[PDB]
């Protein structure tokens, strides 16, 4: 979903569906959370001075991602 451009009309729906994936470490699933923080890290990889993300990826899962043991 995230890593391509299409007629999906806004990126806030991608943001709201990806921000829900912070329950993987709360419920106790390490592998799904590892994949999720890998794709958040890849979203921050292909950006130097860019907004290929939306700015809520810099807000919640980046900051929780600096804590993930």
Give percent helix, percent strand, percent coil of the chain, each to the nearest 5: 50, 0, 50
The residue among 7, 19, 6 whose CA lies nearest residue 54 is 19
- 């807000």: which residue's tokens? 59
Characterise 28 by phi-psi region: left (phi > 0), alpha (psi -120 to 50), beta (else). left
The experimental technique behind this entry is cryo-EM
């Amino acid at each position: 979903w995230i890593f391509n451009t299409e007629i999906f009309p806004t990126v806030k729906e991608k943001a709201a569906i990806l921000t829900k994936m912070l329950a993987f470490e709360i419920r106790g699933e390490p592998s799904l959370s590892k994949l999720f923080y890998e794709i958040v890290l890849k979203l921050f990889d292909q950006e130097h001075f860019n907004n290929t993300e939306i700015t809520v990826r810099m807000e919640q899962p980046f900051l929780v991602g600096t804590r993930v043991e």
